[PDB]
Design a protein around this ligand. Structure first.
Ligand SMILES: C[C@H]1O[C@H](O[C@@H]2C(CO)=C[C@H](N[C@H]3[C@H](O)[C@@H](O)[C@@H](O[C@H]4[C@H](O)[C@@H](O)[C@@H](O[C@H]5[C@H](O)[C@@H](O)[C@@H](O)O[C@@H]5CO)O[C@@H]4CO)O[C@@H]3C)[C@H](O)[C@H]2O)[C@H](O)[C@@H](O)[C@@H]1O
Ligand SMILES: C[C@H]1O[C@H](O[C@@H]2C(CO)=C[C@H](N[C@H]3[C@H](O)[C@@H](O)[C@@H](O[C@H]4[C@H](O)[C@@H](O)[C@@H](O[C@H]5[C@H](O)[C@@H](O)[C@@H](O)O[C@@H]5CO)O[C@@H]4CO)O[C@@H]3C)[C@H](O)[C@H]2O)[C@H](O)[C@@H](O)[C@@H]1O
Ligand SMILES: [Ca+2]
Ligand SMILES: [Ca+2]
Lengths: 441, 441
């Protein structure tokens, strides 16, 4: 199993307007299939006014710019015809400020008023986030305060209200009933105010539901476990980082610690990725790094158990440094050819980090056997033929400073991995591990 | 007559995807009618993969994101419904690289190969643009060289060929029966190789047509004059830039030589604009300027013969420093309210020079008489009750380095206007004029 994270608007255009849409997604299948992609994780396809669409104004209507509900379905159909699943990012933790539910709660409506979170005499208004620490309590003139973790325009939904519960669960059944193979529950970590409350929440919420359930609980390995089992697919921020950090600091330690810590034997499938939209792209890790180091990070990712996910463009090494509040710098148009002028190319805005003629397009890299894509095409094909590695067991045979070597095995398999993090050859079991290379014996 | 240039994607959203479209444009009518707009010029609405949309790939289909032909026309009616005309930007000078005809011409199709311009053995392959001075002749793997004054992906059509003419003649007709009121001809200055050939062309092209034919010719007034009579409406870059520079230098000199140069006695209407997408915005003119000098620029614009045009947002003070290749920095989303979060608002990308809570939104300035909007309103409202001023005659009653005074008159009408370009008070014939104020009597 190999995933691929797509930002719809930047992937492929299907109606000749430069804006990525459902039809173009549909025509990109060959690329995905040639990339050995099993399922696509599609960032917010629901109508919101933002560019990233995490503040949904309606879950029952799609983004006009991506397409119609009919077009959405023919893309689902098509993807299946080609054996690929489709997982939709679902930010049900909060609705946009303009969602009709919030618009009503605001205008006094009682039924919807309970759909959201408001300040109570016994509530701390100076309460801030655990990370950036900006307040979560936002004021209305009528002295009213509704809580919103991710800002005043992403009002948190009351998941205490058993009405919201069904209100939403009915939706999950809707998209599923429509074809959606799975969801990527956006912010799964914050559905309720206490760790214990959230676990049970998901317990009930996913009760009688089948399909890929990917959760985003950006936290300490320890917590991800508790939910772990319940979803079946947990986003492994731990290792996703540690691979790059280890390759960067040319040291196996943290990777070894994180492998044992966040991968080894889990009641669920840790989803390990190259990078995502909330951080700098693989190719820009810590002031960006070596073309050969980028590959090594991709090799390690595909030679470790769990489910390997690639954020669209990472297989080409697209550049991008995370920034605020213009987070669209890491959502550049996917470069199909060098001129970025081809039936299908997106160009809704001029590229921030990845412009035309950069030598990083699909049509450019496809040729040079030394390219990051040609390389990734290598491990994606390998991992396609070795789906037994998903649950495979790991056994370290070498924990040196600049190199790692372990063994992946199951009842009827056993493969030995050789990762050299230094840029100077080292030997193990007769094997001559080259600089910054993964060998597979 | 007052104009309004709208970049559709950044104006109003009618399908809740936070992207401008024909439906929101329709919903933006109250705004426009109340702003005193007689006709809106709409930047390229045809299918193209760029964000601006000047490299068309078909003129018979609308930019997916903006909507369908259905919605396009439901909008056309509503605008006509409110006494507003729809002028369309028409990039018929060239086609996009992906446009059908050029793709067929790339194969050799006898018919379409001659729809474009090819280099000859006696053609200076290293020709150059008059201004920035770049290559006009683009190469092709098989030695070929085609001509595209705007880029290898914007290959100009060959107008020595009647088929190209007919082809575009039908188009205009098509869009006209469609209800469109007129066209803003993009690069209307380079339709032919000889300044004589160009006029002949335009003369013959528009010979039996009716509507607002606004030409775009970026040249000395003398050239604009030769084509003048044929279109009837000419975009006036000469005076448009002078009203801005004269304000910036508090030196009426250039303005007078300019008003004399391109506005006085013309056999067609000079269209005077606040600014456009090919240069910085009014508010950012030459390091941008004070809320004072901005109103003064507008004051002057709405008190001169010809047709005053406002590039969307300029009535608000929208900053925007022009630059390339990311020319979308001047196309910031038109801010309806401060939080930029209200049904109809766009946010397809994070603003470049006009982020949220910047005090320039429409809802914010509607509640302040001193705001650039209130000031523009008075000017459009005034010029609305003085239709005679477009065809009006001018003569200078007073010419002083820092303040201008002149007379607008026709047979039954006469008006005195007083402009103060300096920050120091000035009085003329028993009438003081505060710093940067304008007075009409
Ligand atoms: C309104 C917003 O909507 C969208 O914003 C989105 C939303 C809201 O719909 C949710 C998701 N992302 C959230 C996540 O669901 C949440 O739990 C937390 O995640 C924080 C995390 O809670 C914190 O603990 C720390 O996590 C720590 C770990 O705990 C630690 O163990 C070790 O691994 O280090 C990391 C980081 O140092 O930092 C993370 C990010 O900085 O914030 C991120 C941004 C999306 O990916 C994101 O695009 C847009 O993306 C935004 O731009 C927009 O502003
Ligand atoms: C393919 C392209 O499409 C789009 O570009 C678009 C196209 C392509 O269809 C045409 C139009 N604009 C063209 C214009 O139609 C053309 O004639 C020339 O216009 C030149 C002019 O010909 C030249 O003489 C000089 O003008 C002189 C006057 O003659 C002189 O009297 C005094 O006023 O000083 C000025 C400047 O010093 O500079 C002007 C601009 O720099 O270039 C501008 C950019 C549009 O506004 C523009 O958005 C995008 O904007 C681009 O980013 C993209 O690359
Ligand atoms: Ca599209
Ligand atoms: Ca829209």
């Amino acid at each position: 199993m190999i995933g691929y994270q797509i930002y719809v608007r930047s992937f492929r255009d299907g109606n000749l307007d430069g804006v990525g849409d459902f039809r173009g997604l549909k025509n990109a299948v060959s690329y995905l299939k040639e990339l050995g992609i099993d399922f696509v994780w599609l960032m917010p396809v629901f109508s919101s006014i933002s560019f990233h669409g995490y503040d949904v104004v309606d879950f029952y209507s799609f983004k006009a710019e991506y397409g119609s509900e009919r077009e959405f379905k023919e893309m689902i159909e098509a993807f299946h015809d080609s054996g690929i699943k489709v997982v939709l990012d679902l930010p049900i933790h909060h609705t946009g400020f303009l969602h009709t539910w919030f618009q009503k709660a605001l205008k006094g409506d009682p039924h919807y008023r309970d759909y959201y979170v408001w300040a109570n005499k016994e509530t701390d208004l100076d309460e801030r986030r655990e990370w950036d620490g900006e307040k979560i309590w936002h004021p209305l003139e009528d002295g009213r305060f509704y809580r919103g973790l991710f800002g005043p325009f992403s009002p948190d939904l009351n998941y205490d209200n058993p009405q919201v519960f069904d209100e939403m669960k009915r939706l999950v059944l809707h998209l599923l009933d429509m074809g959606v193979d799975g969801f990527r529950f956006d912010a799964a970590k914050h559905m309720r105010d206490t760790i214990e409350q959230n676990v049970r929440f998901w317990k009930y919420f996913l009760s009688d539901l089948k399909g890929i359930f990917l959760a985003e609980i950006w936290a300490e390995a320890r917590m991800v476990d508790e939910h772990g089992r319940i979803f079946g697919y947990m986003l492994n921020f731990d290792t996703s980082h540690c691979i790059k950090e280890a390759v960067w600091k040319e040291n196996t330690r943290v990777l070894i610690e994180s492998i044992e810590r966040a991968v080894i034997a889990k009641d669920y499938l840790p989803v390990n990725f190259t990078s995502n939209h909330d951080m700098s792209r693989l190719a820009s890790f810590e002031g960006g790094f070596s073309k050969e180091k980028i590959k090594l990070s991709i090799s390690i990712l595909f030679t470790l158990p769990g489910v390997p996910l690639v954020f669209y463009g990472d297989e080409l090494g697209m550049k991008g440094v995370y920034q605020k509040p213009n987070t669209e710098v890491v959502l550049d148009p996917f470069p199909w050819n060098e001129s970025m002028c081809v039936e299908g190319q997106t160009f809704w805005k001029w590229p921030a980090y990845n412009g035309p003629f950069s030598g990083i397009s699909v049509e450019y890299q496809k040729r040079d056997p030394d390219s990051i894509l040609s390389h990734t095409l290598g491990w994606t094909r390998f991992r396609k033929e070795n789906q037994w590695i998903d649950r495979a067991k790991l056994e370290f045979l070498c924990k040196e400073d600049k190199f790692l070597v372990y063994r992946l095995y199951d009842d009827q398999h056993s493969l030995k991995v050789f990762h050299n993090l230094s840029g100077e050859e080292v030997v193990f079991e007769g094997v001559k591990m080259k600089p910054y290379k993964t060998e597979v014996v």
